[PDB]
Design a protein around this ligand. Structure first.
Ligand SMILES: CCCCCCCCCCCCO[C@@H]1O[C@H](CO)[C@@H](O[C@H]2O[C@H](CO)[C@@H](O)[C@H](O)[C@H]2O)[C@H](O)[C@H]1O
Ligand SMILES: [Zn+2]
Length: 459
């Protein structure tokens, strides 16, 4: 039919997938802390381990859609499995194993969905793939905005008319029917828009490999659930992957090439840093929003409205959509990014010195997330081939996986013990982390500009 139509369908199903996913992420930590009894340390480590899994998962999932099942087939399978996972989240049973298994299913589903939906856009546009991917990114952002604003409100509302459960599980249901809606979209536009795409979807499904894939999917679901349960297991796995990438980069260097390689290394550790800084919003910043922020949002000086802590995360995509058209009107952009993130974290750090009544800020979250999200926008060029100045393109992925977990253990530095609820005492330990992160980010700014001549040497 058209290229715009195909890109439309893939951006649509993408939009709804991300709607579901972020609809869950916005509430997951608060679920583990408030509804479940987890302490914020375990919440951080677990959610970040899961995040690492989710972000390293599409590696395998991408190869499956290209080389075994149909890219469209794999995408769909991922969507269905995702729906199943959220469905598992929706049943009101406070059984840690149950939720962990649900998370495993979500991980697998994502690994199968994300990289193949991304391949489609690339095949629908065969340099205008950037024109596509930007719009794509925007669709992702509006979806994620809608969900991150909707689901916490569902959580609160249902928790009022009914007792504790569902409330949370209701929200997870919202995610689920989000996925179902997306799948309905695809179904109503399948051969219509998509039509042509995939490396091996031109034939019927090979039931042997489909079987072995579903089996191994169950197996990976189990592996996931177990990794999530035991903190030490997660620690060992992640640490192992760390030794792996350490070794890979160790061997890569073993005269003229080093100008590209060392630069790539400094770059990849910078990426690690940046992803820690990102991971902070999912955890410690979210927790901070929950325990040390006046949920009463005032437009100086009236009242509308009243935040629900999770909804503060919705500030991230909103600001992205707002400041994107402004920026529309060179590894130094990395440095700019790090600096902007820095002053964001200083705003969170300076949240104590001003606007404080115990738990008070509100606007600190807004300007903070503004700066931080701008900083996110500034580093769109994380591309694996971008550091490819010389394996490293691969190891980069795994390192970028571990980065998340590390972000978790960083957010653990502002772990508030459960028996401490006097916010007047909790506020500093957050602003101590946040003021400390601000300084760290500035060092990263120095790193970026210092390694900039090494980018000039190769050229
Ligand atoms: C596709 C992109 C679309 C983006 C727009 C998305 C719209 C978001 C819809 C849901 C918004 C709900 O988010 C907001 O949650 C807060 C906190 O519970 C609600 O707060 C509401 O109930 C609380 C508690 O009874 C009251 O104190 C408050 O006066 C009232 O507004 C708001 O009514 C709601 O606006
Ligand atoms: Zn300071």
């Amino acid at each position: 039919v058209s290229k715009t139509h195909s890109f439309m369908t893939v951006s649509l199903i993408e939009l709804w997938e991300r709607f579901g996913y972020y609809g869950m992420q916005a509430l997951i930590v608060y679920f583990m802390v408030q509804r479940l009894g987890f302490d914020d340390s375990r919440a951080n480590l677990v959610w970040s381990a899961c995040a690492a899994l989710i972000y390293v998962s599409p590696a395998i999932g991408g190869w499956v859609g290209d080389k075994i099942l149909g890219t469209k087939r794999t995408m769909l399978l991922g969507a269905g499995i995702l729906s199943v996972g959220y469905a598992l989240m929706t049943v009101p049973t406070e059984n840690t194993w149950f939720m962990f298994s649900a998370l495993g299913v979500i991980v697998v589903g994502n690994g199968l969905f994300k990289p193949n939906a991304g391949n489609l856009v690339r095949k629908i546009y065969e340099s205008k793939i950037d024109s596509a991917f930007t719009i794509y990114y925007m669709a992702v952002n509006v979806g994620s905005t809608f969900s991150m604003l909707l689901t916490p409100w569902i959580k609160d509302y249902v928790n009022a008319q009914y007792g504790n459960e569902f409330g949370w599980h209701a929200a997870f249901a919202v995610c689920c029917v989000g996925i179902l809606v997306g799948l309905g979209n695809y179904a109503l536009m399948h051969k219509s828009l998509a039509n042509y795409g995939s490396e091996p979807d031109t034939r019927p499904v090979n039931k042997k490999s489909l079987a072995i894939v579903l089996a191994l999917a169950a197996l990976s679901v189990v592996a996931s659930a177990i990794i999530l349960e035991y903190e030490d297991v997660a620690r060992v796995f992640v640490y192992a992957a760390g030794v792996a990438v350490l070794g890979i980069f160790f061997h890569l260097i073993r005269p003229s090439e080093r100008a590209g390689l060392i630069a790539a290394l400094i770059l990849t550790v910078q990426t690690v840093f940046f992803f820690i800084f990102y991971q902070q919003m999912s955890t410690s910043l979210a927790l901070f929003a929950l325990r040390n922020v006046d949920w009463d949002f005032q437009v100086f000086g009236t009242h509308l409205w009243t935040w629900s802590p999770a909804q503060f995360q919705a500030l991230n995509p909103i600001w992205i959509m707002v400041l994107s058209p402004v920026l529309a009107w060179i590894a130094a952009k990395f440095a700019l990014g790090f600096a902007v993130v820095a002053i964001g974290f200083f705003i969170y750090g300076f949240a104590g010195q001003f606007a404080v009544n115990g738990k008070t800020s509100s606007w600190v979250m807004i300007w903070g997330y503004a700066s931080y999200s701008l900083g996110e926008l500034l580093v769109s060029g994380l591309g694996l081939a971008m550091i490819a100045r010389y394996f490293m393109m691969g190891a980069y992925f795994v390192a970028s996986g571990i980065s998340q977990y590390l972000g978790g253990v960083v957010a653990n530095f502002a772990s508030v013990p459960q028996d401490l609820v006097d916010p007047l005492q909790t506020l500093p330990v957050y602003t101590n982390l946040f003021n400390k992160l601000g300084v760290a980010a500035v060092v990263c700014t120095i790193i970026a500009l210092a390694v900039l001549p090494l980018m000039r040497r190769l050229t």
